[PDB]
Design a protein around this ligand. Structure first.
Ligand SMILES: *[C@@H]1O[C@H](CO)[C@@H](O[C@@H]2O[C@H](CO)[C@@H](O[C@@H]3O[C@H](CO[C@H]4O[C@H](CO[C@H]5O[C@H](CO)[C@@H](O)[C@H](O)[C@@H]5O)[C@@H](O)[C@H](O[C@H]5O[C@H](CO)[C@@H](O)[C@H](O)[C@@H]5O)[C@@H]4O)[C@@H](O)[C@H](O[C@H]4O[C@H](CO)[C@@H](O)[C@H](O)[C@@H]4O)[C@@H]3O)[C@H](O)[C@H]2NC(C)=O)[C@H](O)[C@H]1NC(C)=O
Ligand SMILES: *[C@@H]1O[C@H](CO)[C@@H](O[C@@H]2O[C@H](CO)[C@@H](O[C@@H]3O[C@H](CO[C@H]4O[C@H](CO)[C@@H](O)[C@H](O)[C@@H]4O[C@@H]4O[C@H](CO)[C@@H](O[C@@H]5O[C@H](CO)[C@H](O)[C@H](O)[C@H]5O)[C@H](O)[C@H]4NC(C)=O)[C@@H](O)[C@H](O)[C@@H]3O)[C@H](O)[C@H]2NC(C)=O)[C@H](O)[C@H]1NC(C)=O
Ligand SMILES: *[C@@H]1O[C@H](CO)[C@@H](O[C@@H]2O[C@H](CO)[C@@H](O[C@@H]3O[C@H](CO[C@H]4O[C@H](CO)[C@@H](O)[C@H](O)[C@@H]4O)[C@@H](O)[C@H](O[C@H]4O[C@H](CO)[C@@H](O)[C@H](O)[C@@H]4O)[C@@H]3O)[C@H](O)[C@H]2NC(C)=O)[C@H](O)[C@H]1NC(C)=O
Ligand SMILES: *[C@@H]1O[C@H](CO[C@@H]2O[C@@H](C)[C@@H](O)[C@@H](O)[C@@H]2O)[C@@H](O[C@@H]2O[C@H](CO)[C@@H](O[C@@H]3O[C@H](CO)[C@@H](O)[C@H](O)[C@@H]3O)[C@H](O)[C@H]2NC(C)=O)[C@H](O)[C@H]1NC(C)=O
Ligand SMILES: *[C@@H]1O[C@H](CO)[C@@H](O[C@@H]2O[C@H](CO)[C@@H](O[C@@H]3O[C@H](CO)[C@@H](O)[C@H](O)[C@@H]3O)[C@H](O)[C@H]2NC(C)=O)[C@H](O)[C@H]1NC(C)=O
Ligand SMILES: *[C@@H]1O[C@H](CO)[C@@H](O[C@@H]2O[C@H](CO)[C@@H](O[C@@H]3O[C@H](CO)[C@@H](O)[C@H](O)[C@@H]3O)[C@H](O)[C@H]2NC(C)=O)[C@H](O)[C@H]1NC(C)=O
Ligand SMILES: *[C@@H]1O[C@H](CO)[C@@H](O[C@@H]2O[C@H](CO)[C@@H](O[C@@H]3O[C@H](CO)[C@@H](O)[C@H](O)[C@@H]3O)[C@H](O)[C@H]2NC(C)=O)[C@H](O)[C@H]1NC(C)=O
Ligand SMILES: *[C@@H]1O[C@H](CO)[C@@H](O[C@@H]2O[C@H](CO)[C@@H](O[C@@H]3O[C@H](CO)[C@@H](O)[C@H](O)[C@@H]3O)[C@H](O)[C@H]2NC(C)=O)[C@H](O)[C@H]1NC(C)=O
Ligand SMILES: *[C@@H]1O[C@H](CO)[C@@H](O[C@@H]2O[C@H](CO)[C@@H](O[C@@H]3O[C@H](CO)[C@@H](O)[C@H](O)[C@@H]3O)[C@H](O)[C@H]2NC(C)=O)[C@H](O)[C@H]1NC(C)=O
Ligand SMILES: *[C@@H]1O[C@H](CO)[C@@H](O[C@@H]2O[C@H](CO)[C@@H](O[C@@H]3O[C@H](CO)[C@@H](O)[C@H](O)[C@@H]3O)[C@H](O)[C@H]2NC(C)=O)[C@H](O)[C@H]1NC(C)=O
Ligand SMILES: *[C@@H]1O[C@H](CO[C@@H]2O[C@@H](C)[C@@H](O)[C@@H](O)[C@@H]2O)[C@@H](O[C@@H]2O[C@H](CO)[C@@H](O)[C@H](O)[C@H]2NC(C)=O)[C@H](O)[C@H]1NC(C)=O
Ligand SMILES: *[C@@H]1O[C@H](CO)[C@@H](O)[C@H](O)[C@H]1NC(C)=O
Ligand SMILES: *[C@@H]1O[C@H](CO)[C@@H](O)[C@H](O)[C@H]1NC(C)=O
Ligand SMILES: *[C@@H]1O[C@H](CO)[C@@H](O)[C@H](O)[C@H]1NC(C)=O
Ligand SMILES: *[C@@H]1O[C@H](CO)[C@@H](O)[C@H](O)[C@H]1NC(C)=O
Ligand SMILES: *[C@@H]1O[C@H](CO)[C@@H](O)[C@H](O)[C@H]1NC(C)=O
Ligand SMILES: *[C@@H]1O[C@H](CO)[C@@H](O)[C@H](O)[C@H]1NC(C)=O
Ligand SMILES: *[C@@H]1O[C@H](CO)[C@@H](O)[C@H](O)[C@H]1NC(C)=O
Lengths: 216, 240, 322, 54, 54
C-alpha cells in the first residue's frame, strides 16, 4: 500500500552519470527480484526502462542499468541523454502477486540556471469586499527547480485555516509558477493590521507583506 | 502493431459506477492478462487491477478492492472494468497496459501456457491510450471572477502583475484570455484547485510593465464552458 | 554450431512460397514458419544427387517378353497384328511433370489420342503429337550457395546474396510451331464432328494441377499454363494461326514439395549456382473435358495433371508384358 | 513447439505406474522421473497398429 | 543427466592429441575443440565388441 519511496526530483548535466535509488520492503523488493522502473515523459504514456533488474527491456540502450540491495532498488544512468527527462517510478511485485508503484522522481537535464521566485501578494479587491468575501493570493513565478513551500501569517500570528497552496506549474519560459490562496472574511481581513506570505525556495527565502489601506 | 485503446471514462460523481472498456488489436488477446493502472493529478502511477489470461484469478489493490471488478472478453478481444461506490480520490487517468510479451523467456527458450497461451507475470511492456475519469461531489455552478489589482512582482525595473481570480465554479476547465487573446506575453493560468466548498478556483495572471498601467487597458475574458458562462472583467489600479 | 553450446544467427535468401505467416499481428514485421515443417518433417535434398531424367529401359525376366504394336494408328487398348517381340523397352525419360509431357517419343504418322471412357468427361484424355516444339522456362540470373555447418558434419546449403540485378525468372514459348501442332491436334480432335471445340484453363485445386509443375536442377519450376487456352479453333483454323504469339509468360519457382502426395520428410532443393535454362521438346498432353458442357454443342477441354501415372503410360500403350 | 526455440507447457492425465517420485529431494513435491527413461529410450506404439490376436 | 533438462558438471581425462585449443588462446586455459568433431561426427566404439584378429 505504501508506495516505494524515492526523492521527489533530481537533475544532472548533459552526459553526467546519475543513480536513482528507491526504498521498499522485504515483502516486495527483498522477497522477489521482479522489480521494474517505468518512465513517463510530459505528454507521453508510461514506458518501461528496467525489468529483471540486472537486464533491460526493449528500446533501452546499455546506458541504463539496474541493481538491487535488500529492500532497495537502484536505476543507474551513465551519459544522460535528452530523452532521459521525465518522471521515473520504481515498482515491485508483492508476495500476494499484487503490484505497487513508487512515489516518483522527476529527472531533468541541467542547463537552466536556478532563479529566485519573484513573489508578490494581491490584496482583497473591492469587488470581493462588497460581496462579503476576501481572499489573499500569493503569486510565485519565475523560479527553478519547481520546489517551493508557501506559508501564511498575520502581522504577529500564523495562519493555517483557508490556506490552499497550488503546485508549481511550469511556465512557458521553462520556469515554475504557483498561486497560494488564503480565504478570509472582510471583517477578518480588516481586523489584522497586516498579513504576510513567506515563501521558501532552495535555501534562500523570500516574503511579501500586505496591509489594509482605505483611500478614495 | 500491437495497439490498445481505452474508452468509457468520463466525468462522474461518487457513489455511482463506471464501465471502462479497453479494446486491443495486433495480437491474440485471448490469453493476454491485462493491467489496469491509474494516475491521479499531482501523483505518480498507481496500480488498480490485474486479471489472469483465463480470468480464473484476479488481483486488486486493497484501497480499490471491492470498488472495481475486472473481466475479459476473448471473443471481442476486449477488457472491462466495472466500478462501484466511486470516491472523489479516484480522479485519475486510467491506462490499460499489456503483459510481458506472449511467452516467458529463459535461456533463450520461450514457454507458452496450456493450450499455447500467451502468459506471463512480469513488467508491462505496452501501454494504451488512456481515458480520464473525474469523480467529484460538488454540483455544476457558474464562476465568480474578481480583479486582482496590479501588484509589483519585481521592485526594480517597475514590473507589475495584473490578475483575474476565478472561483466558485464546477466542473473543470475554465478558459481565460486577455484582450480577446491579443495579449499573450506573461499570461499564465493556474490549475483548478479544489476549494473547501467543493467548487474550484484558479487565477489568470499577466505580468506587464508598471508604467503600462493607465495607458494599456486590460480586460480579462473568462469563459466557463461546462457552465456555458462568459464574462469580460476589467482590471485597473486600485483607487482605495 | 558443431559445438553443443555455441549457436549462431545468420542470414540468407528464401522464398515467400516456402513459408506462411503466423502470430497474426496483422502487419507489423510478421514472423513466418515453413509450410511443410508445421505439417510434416524436412531434410536436405542431397545436392550431389541430380534430378534430371535419364532414359530408363525396363527389361523382363526369362519366360516373359514385351509385345509391341508398331501400328501407328493403333490406339491404347484393342487388337493388333504387327507384332514385335522385345526383351527391354525403349528408354523412357521419366520427366516428372504435370499437364504436359516432354522429351517423349512422338506418335509419328498421326496424332494419337486415348481415353478411359469418352462418354465420361472426368476421364483423362491422353494425347501424343507428331512434331516437337521448344518450350524454354528460364531463370537467367545466377544463384548462390553457402554451406552453413549445423552439426559435427551436418551442413545446410543456403542461398547467399545474389550478385547483380535479381531479375525474376520467367518462361518463353514459340507460338508458330505450337499453333501448327494445335492445327494438327484440332484436326485430330474430331471424334464425331467437323468444326466445334473450346479450350479453357484448369478449374483450380492443388497447386501442382493449377499450373505446369516440373523439375529443373532440383528447383521445382511451376511454370504457368495460361497461354494454352487463349485460342479458339472453333470454325477456321487458319483464323487462329494468323495471330502468332511469341509467348513470354511468368513461371514461379519452389524449393520443397511432397512427392506423390507424400506429406512426410520433404526435401529442400539446394542452390543450383549458375544460369538455369530448361528448354524441352513437346510430345503430348493430358487434357480433361468439362462436366459443365452440353452433349453435342461444344466440348470444353482444359489441361489436367492430377494422375502422374498418366504421364508415364503415354509410351507404354505400345508395349505390353506377355 | 514445432519450431526449435519455441516451447510450451501443456497438461494431461497420467498414471502413477508410468513414473516414480524423484527421491533425490526431500519428497516428491511434484517431481517425478520415468522408470524406463533412465534405463533406455522410449517411443510410441504406433496407435494405428493395435495389439489384438489373429 | 538421464533426465532431459538436468545437467551435471562431471570431470574426466582426455588425451593431448585428441583436442586442440580454440578462441585465439594466446596464453590462458582457453576452451578446446575435438580434432575430428568439426570435420565429422563421432560415436562410441561398442566396448563389448573387441577388435582383436582371428
Ligand atoms: C535466434 O535465437 C535468438 C535466441 O533468443 C533470438 O533472439 C531473440 O530475437 C527476438 C526477435 O528479434 C528478440 O526480440 C526483440 O528483443 C529486443 C531486445 O530484447 C532484449 O530483451 C530480451 C528479453 O529479456 C528477457 O528474456 C531473457 C531470455 O530471452 C532473459 O534472460 C532476461 O532476463 C529477460 O527476462 C532478451 O532476450 C534479449 O537478450 C539479448 O540482450 C542481452 C542484453 O540485454 C544479452 O545479454 C543477451 O545475450 C541477448 O543478446 C534483449 O536483452 C527488443 O528491443 C525487441 O522489441 C521490439 O518490439 C517492441 C514492441 O514489443 C518495440 O517497441 C521495439 O522497438 C522492438 O521493435 C524484441 O523484443 C529477442 O530479444 C531475442 N532474444 C535473445 C536472447 O537474443 C533470435 O531472434 C533468433 N533468430 C531469429 C531470426 O529469430
Ligand atoms: C488438491 O487438494 C489441495 C489440498 O486441499 C487443493 O489445494 C488447496 O488446499 C488448501 C488447503 O488449506 C485449501 O484451503 C482452504 O480454502 C477454503 C476456501 O477459502 C476461500 O473461500 C472462503 C469462503 O468459503 C473464504 O473465506 C476464504 O478467504 C477463501 O476465499 C477468499 O475469496 C476472496 C474473494 O474471492 C478473496 O479476496 C481477494 O482479494 C484480493 C484483494 O485482497 C483481490 O481483490 C481478489 O480478486 C479477491 O478475490 C480472498 O483473498 C480469499 N481468501 C484468501 C485467503 O485468499 C478455506 O475455507 C479453508 O479453511 C482452507 O483454507 C484450498 O481450498 C485448496 N484449493 C482449492 C481450489 O480448493 C487443490 O486445489 C486440490 N486440487 C485441485 C485440482 O483442486
Ligand atoms: C517445465 O514446466 C514447469 C511447470 O510449468 C516449469 O516450472 C516453473 O518454470 C518457471 C519458468 O522457468 C520457473 O520460474 C523461475 O523460478 C525460480 C524461482 O524464482 C523465485 O521464486 C520462488 C518462489 O517465490 C522463490 O522461492 C525463489 O527463491 C526465487 O526467489 C527462478 O529461477 C526464476 O526467478 C528469476 O527470474 C525471473 C525471470 O522469469 C525474474 O523475473 C525474477 O525476478 C527472478 O530473478 C524464475 O521465476 C519456476 O521456478 C518453475 N517452477 C517449478 C516448480 O519448476 C519449468 O520451468 C519448466 N522447465 C522447462 C525447462 O521448460
Ligand atoms: C489438474 O486439474 C486442475 C483442474 O483443471 C480442470 O479440471 C480438469 C479435470 C480439466 O477438465 C481441465 O480442463 C480443467 O481446467 C488444474 O487447475 C486449474 O483449474 C482451474 C479451475 O478454476 C482451471 O480454470 C479454467 O481456465 C480456463 C482458461 O483460463 C477457463 O476458460 C475456465 O473457465 C476455467 O476458469 C484451469 O484451467 C486449470 N488449469 C489447467 C492447467 O488446466 C491443475 O492445474 C491440473 N494440474 C496440473 C499439474 O496442471
Ligand atoms: C523470353 O524472350 C524475350 C525476348 O527474347 C526476353 O525478353 C526480354 O525482356 C527484358 C525485360 O522485359 C528486356 O530487357 C529490356 O530490353 C529493352 C529493349 O531491348 C531495353 O531497353 C532495357 O534496357 C532492358 O534491357 C529484353 O530486351 C528482352 N529481350 C529482347 C531480346 O528484347 C525474355 O527475357 C525471355 N525470357 C523469359 C521470358 O524468361
Ligand atoms: C528455345 O530455345 C531454343 C534453343 O535451345 C531456341 O532455338 C534456337 O534459337 C537460336 C536463336 O535464339 C538459334 O540460333 C540462331 O539460328 C539462326 C538460324 O536459324 C542463325 O542465323 C543465328 O545466327 C543463330 O545462330 C538456334 O539455331 C535455335 N536452335 C534450335 C534447335 O531451334 C528457341 O528459339 C527458343 N524458343 C523460345 C520461345 O525461347
Ligand atoms: C497465370 O497466368 C494467368 C494469365 O496469363 C493469370 O491469370 C490472370 O491473373 C490476373 C491477375 O489476377 C487477372 O486479372 C484480373 O483483372 C481484373 C480486371 O477487372 C481485376 O478485377 C482482377 O482483380 C484481376 O486483376 C486475370 O483475369 C487472370 N486471367 C486471365 C488473364 O485469363 C494467373 O494468375 C497466372 N498464374 C500464375 C500462378 O502465375
Ligand atoms: C470458315 O471461314 C469461311 C470463310 O473463308 C466460312 O465460309 C463462309 O461462311 C459465311 C458464314 O459464316 C458464309 O456467308 C453466308 O452469306 C450468305 C449471304 O451471302 C448467308 O445467307 C449465309 O447464311 C452465310 O452467312 C459464306 O458464304 C462462306 N463462304 C465460303 C466460301 O464458304 C466458313 O463458314 C468458316 N467455317 C465455318 C465452320 O463456319
Ligand atoms: C507470323 O509470322 C510471319 C513471319 O514468318 C508473318 O509473315 C509476315 O507478316 C507480315 C505482316 O505481319 C507481312 O508484311 C507485309 O509484307 C509485304 C511485303 O512482303 C508488305 O508489302 C506489306 O505491307 C506487309 O508489310 C509479311 O509479308 C509476312 N511474311 C511472310 C513470309 O509471310 C505473319 O504475318 C505473322 N502472323 C501474324 C498474324 O502477324
Ligand atoms: C529435355 O531435353 C533437353 C535437351 O536434352 C534438356 O535440356 C537440358 O537442360 C539442362 C538445364 O535445364 C542443361 O543442363 C546444363 O547444361 C549446360 C550445358 O553447357 C551445363 O553447362 C550445365 O552445367 C547444366 O548441366 C542440359 O545441358 C540440357 N541439355 C541436355 C541434357 O542435353 C531438358 O532438361 C530435358 N527436360 C527435362 C525436364 O529434363
Ligand atoms: C553448465 O555450464 C554453465 C556455463 O558454464 C560454461 O559452460 C560450461 C559447459 C563450461 O564450458 C564452463 O567452463 C563455461 O563457463 C555453468 O555455469 C552456470 O550455469 C548456470 C545455469 O545456466 C548459471 O545460472 C550460472 O550463472 C553459471 N555460472 C557461471 C559461473 O558460469 C554451470 O555450472 C554448468 N552446470 C553445472 C551443473 O555446473
Ligand atoms: C488487420 O489489421 C487491422 C489493423 O491494421 C486490425 O484492426 C484487424 O483486426 C486485423 N485483422 C484481423 C482479422 O485481426
Ligand atoms: C510392322 O513391323 C515391322 C518390323 O519389322 C515394320 O518394319 C513395319 O513398318 C510395321 N508395320 C506397321 C504397319 O506397323
Ligand atoms: C500429324 O498428325 C496429323 C493428325 O493427327 C496429320 O494430319 C499430319 O499429317 C501428321 N503429320 C505427320 C505424320 O508428319
Ligand atoms: C462409357 O461410359 C458410359 C456412361 O458414362 C457408358 O454408357 C458406356 O458404356 C461406357 N463405355 C465404355 C467403353 O466403358
Ligand atoms: C553470377 O553469374 C555469372 C554469369 O554471368 C557467373 O559466372 C557467376 O558464377 C555467378 N555468381 C555466383 C554463382 O556466385
Ligand atoms: C472463344 O469463344 C467463346 C465464345 O463461346 C468466348 O467466350 C471465349 O472468350 C473465346 N476464347 C478466347 C480465348 O477469347
Ligand atoms: C529434508 O528436509 C530437511 C529439512 O528441510 C533437510 O535438512 C534435509 O536436508 C532434506 N533432505 C534431503 C535434501 O535429502
Amino acid at each position: 500500500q505504501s508506495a516505494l519511496t524515492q526523492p521527489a526530483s533530481v537533475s544532472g548535466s548533459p552526459g553526467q552519470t546519475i543513480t536513482i535509488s528507491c526504498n521498499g520492503t522485504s515483502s516486495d523488493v527483498g522477497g522477489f527480484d521482479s522489480v521494474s522502473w517505468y518512465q513517463q515523459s510530459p505528454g507521453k504514456a508510461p514506458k518501461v526502462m528496467v525489468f529483471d533488474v540486472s537486464h533491460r527491456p526493449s528500446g533501452i540502450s546499455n546506458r541504463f542499468s539496474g541493481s538491487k540491495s535488500g529492500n532497495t532498488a537502484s536505476l543507474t544512468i551513465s551519459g544522460l541523454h535528452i530523452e532521459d527527462e521525465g518522471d521515473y517510478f520504481c515498482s515491485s511485485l508483492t508476495d500476494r502477486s499484487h503490484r505497487i508503484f513508487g512515489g516518483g522522481t522527476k529527472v531533468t537535464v541541467l542547463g537552466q540556471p536556478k532563479a529566485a521566485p519573484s513573489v508578490t501578494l494581491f490584496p482583497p479587491s473591492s469587488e470581493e469586499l462588497q460581496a462579503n468575501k476576501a481572499t489573499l493570493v500569493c503569486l510565485i513565478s519565475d523560479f527553478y527547480p519547481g520546489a517551493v513551500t508557501v506559508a501564511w501569517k498575520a502581522d504577529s500570528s500564523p495562519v493555517k485555516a483557508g490556506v490552499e497552496t497550488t503546485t508549481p506549474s511550469k511556465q512557458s519560459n521553462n520556469k515554475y509558477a504557483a498561486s497560494s490562496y488564503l480565504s478570509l472574511t472582510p471583517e477578518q481581513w480588516k481586523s489584522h493590521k497586516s498579513y504576510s506570505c513567506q515563501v521558501t525556495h532552495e535555501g534562500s527565502t523570500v516574503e511579501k507583506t500586505v496591509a489594509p489601506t482605505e483611500c478614495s | 502493431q500491437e495497439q490498445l485503446v481505452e474508452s468509457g471514462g468520463g466525468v462522474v460523481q461518487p457513489g455511482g459506477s463506471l464501465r471502462l472498456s479497453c479494446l486491443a488489436s495486433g495480437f491474440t488477446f485471448h490469453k493476454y492478462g491485462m493491467h489496469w493502472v491509474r494516475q491521479a493529478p499531482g501523483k505518480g502511477l498507481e496500480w488498480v487491477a490485474l486479471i489472469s489470461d483465463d480470468g480464473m484469478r484476479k488481483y486488486h489493490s486493497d484501497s480499490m478492492w471491492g470498488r472495481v471488478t475486472i473481466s475479459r472478453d476473448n471473443s471481442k478481444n476486449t477488457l472491462y472494468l466495472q466500478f462501484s461506490s466511486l470516491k472523489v480520490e479516484d480522479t485519475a487517468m486510467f491506462f490499460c497496459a499489456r503483459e510481458a510479451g506472449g511467452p516467458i523467456w529463459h535461456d533463450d527458450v520461450k514457454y507458452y501456457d496450456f493450450n499455447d497461451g500467451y502468459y506471463n507475470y512480469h513488467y508491462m511492456d505496452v501501454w494504451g491510450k488512456g481515458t480520464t475519469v473525474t469523480v467529484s461531489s460538488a454540483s455544476t455552478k457558474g464562476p465568480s471572477v474578481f480583479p486582482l489589482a496590479p501588484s509589483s512582482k519585481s521592485t526594480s525595473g517597475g514590473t507589475a502583475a495584473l490578475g483575474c481570480l476565478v472561483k466558485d465554479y464546477f466542473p473543470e476547465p475554465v478558459t481565460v484570455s486577455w484582450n480577446s487573446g491579443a495579449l499573450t506575453s506573461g499570461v499564465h493560468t493556474f490549475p483548478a484547485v479544489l476549494q473547501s466548498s467543493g467548487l474550484y478556483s484558479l487565477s489568470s495572471v499577466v505580468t506587464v510593465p508598471s508604467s503600462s498601467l493607465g495607458t494599456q487597458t486590460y480586460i480579462c475574458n473568462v469563459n466557463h464552458k461546462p457552465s456555458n458562462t462568459k464574462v469580460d472583467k476589467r482590471v485597473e489600479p486600485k483607487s482605495c | 554450431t558443431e559445438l553443443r553450446d555455441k549457436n549462431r544467427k545468420v542470414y540468407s535468401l528464401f522464398y515467400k512460397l516456402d513459408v506462411v505467416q503466423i502470430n497474426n499481428g496483422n502487419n507489423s514485421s510478421n514472423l513466418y514458419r515453413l509450410i511443410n515443417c508445421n505439417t510434416s518433417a524436412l531434410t536436405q535434398a542431397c545436392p550431389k544427387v541430380t534430378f534430371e531424367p535419364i532414359p530408363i529401359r525396363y527389361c523382363a525376366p526369362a519366360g516373359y517378353a514385351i509385345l509391341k504394336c508398331n501400328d501407328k494408328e493403333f490406339n491404347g487398348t484393342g487388337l493388333c497384328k504387327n507384332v514385335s517381340t522385345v526383351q527391354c523397352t525403349h528408354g523412357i525419360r521419366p520427366v516428372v511433370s504435370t499437364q504436359l509431357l516432354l522429351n517423349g517419343s512422338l506418335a509419328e504418322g498421326k496424332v494419337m489420342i486415348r481415353s478411359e471412357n469418352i462418354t465420361n468427361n472426368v476421364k483423362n484424355i491422353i494425347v501424343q503429337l507428331n512434331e516437337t516444339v521448344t518450350i524454354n522456362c528460364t531463370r537467367p540470373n545466377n544463384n548462390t550457395r553457402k554451406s552453413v555447418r549445423i552439426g559435427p558434419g551436418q551442413t545446410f546449403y543456403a542461398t547467399g546474396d545474389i550478385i547483380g540485378d535479381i531479375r525474376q525468372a520467367h518462361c518463353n514459348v514459340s507460338g508458330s510451331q505450337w499453333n501448327r501442332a494445335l492445327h494438327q491436334v484440332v484436326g485430330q480432335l474430331r471424334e464425331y464432328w467437323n468444326t466445334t471445340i473450346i479450350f479453357k484453363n484448369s478449374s483450380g485445386g492443388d497447386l501442382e494441377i493449377t499450373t505446369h509443375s516440373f523439375n529443373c536442377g532440383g528447383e521445382f519450376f511451376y511454370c504457368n499454363t495460361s497461354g494454352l487456352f487463349n485460342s479458339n479453333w472453333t470454325h477456321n483454323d487458319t483464323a487462329s494461326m494468323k495471330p502468332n504469339d511469341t509467348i513470354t509468360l511468368p513461371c514461379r519457382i519452389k524449393q520443397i514439395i511432397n512427392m506423390w502426395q507424400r506429406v512426410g520428410q520433404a526435401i529442400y532443393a539446394p542452390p543450383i549456382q549458375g544460369v538455369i535454362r530448361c528448354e524441352s521438346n513437346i510430345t503430348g498432353l493430358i487434357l480433361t473435358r468439362d462436366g459443365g458442357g452440353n452433349i453435342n454443342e461444344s466440348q470444353i477441354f482444359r489441361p489436367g495433371g492430377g494422375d502422374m501415372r498418366d504421364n508415364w503410360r503415354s509410351e507404354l500403350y505400345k508395349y505390353k508384358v506377355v
